[PDB]
């Protein structure tokens, strides 16, 4: 439970940008294995992660440090590459979003404090 | 070049830590599809990336910004997740290295 300048950056600059991205829509809520006909999803992916959960954790001061938050973003993208076929459009969508994620993280303010 | 603090950090902290890690050995040279018996590898992975390449690039000041180096690290990990079966040990090794990558990048100095 903390508010830091980096977590505020992650909430208000990084997530705001990814959230509104045209490829973001499959990532804004937990993967719905029932809706999508993916009965194997939870057998392969043991730690589901999505932006909605990350955003809410940012708003409830769940994270102690930015790195904890960056790890959740990473799990979300990693689940997608691991579960899906290489040829699935979702993979290209994740890669596009994760490039922004890394770009924005490179500009994160570096007095880790509050 | 004079080397940005960011690229100095990627070399002296991030690559330092990854190169020597006990899980790093599959990642230190390009994947050898012939040696490993992987006739589909270059069908699926269109942009191979490995630490030897990234390390050489850091040594020779090939990179213009930190984010370009960080992209290469990301491509290397991602190739791995995309190509291999979810249950392969290599995936776990990649996940462990990448967690370190992200942990360190969290503390990387500001640009400019």
């Amino acid at each position: 439970g903390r508010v830091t300048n980096q977590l505020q950056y992650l909430h208000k600059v990084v997530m705001k940008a990814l959230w509104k991205h045209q490829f973001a829509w499959p990532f804004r809520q937990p993967v719905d294995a029932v809706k999508l006909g993916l009965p194997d999803y939870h057998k392969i992916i043991k730690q589901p992660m999505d932006m909605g959960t990350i955003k809410r954790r940012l708003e409830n001061n769940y994270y102690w440090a930015a790195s904890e938050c960056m790890q959740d973003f990473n799990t979300m993208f990693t689940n997608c590459y691991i579960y899906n076929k290489p040829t699935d459009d979702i993979v290209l969508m994740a890669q596009t979003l994760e490039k922004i994620f890394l770009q924005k993280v490179a500009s994160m303010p570096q007095e880790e404090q509050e | 070049g004079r080397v940005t603090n960011q690229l100095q950090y990627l070399h002296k902290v991030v690559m330092k830590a990854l190169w020597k890690h006990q899980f790093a050995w599959p990642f230190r040279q390009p994947v050898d599809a012939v040696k490993l018996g992987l006739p589909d590898y270059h069908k699926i992975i269109k942009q191979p990336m490995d630490m030897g390449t990234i390390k050489r690039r850091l040594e020779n000041n090939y990179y213009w910004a930190a984010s370009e180096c960080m992209q290469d690290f990301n491509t290397m990990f991602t190739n791995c997740y995309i190509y291999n079966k979810p249950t392969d040990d290599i995936v776990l090794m990649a996940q462990t290295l990448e967690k370190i990558f992200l942990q360190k990048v969290a503390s990387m100095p500001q640009e400019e």
């Binding site: 699935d88 993979v91 | 979810p86 249950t87």
Partner: peptide
Amino acid sequence: KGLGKGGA
């Protein structure tokens, strides 16, 4: 080894 979301 997946089932996937599709393409296309």
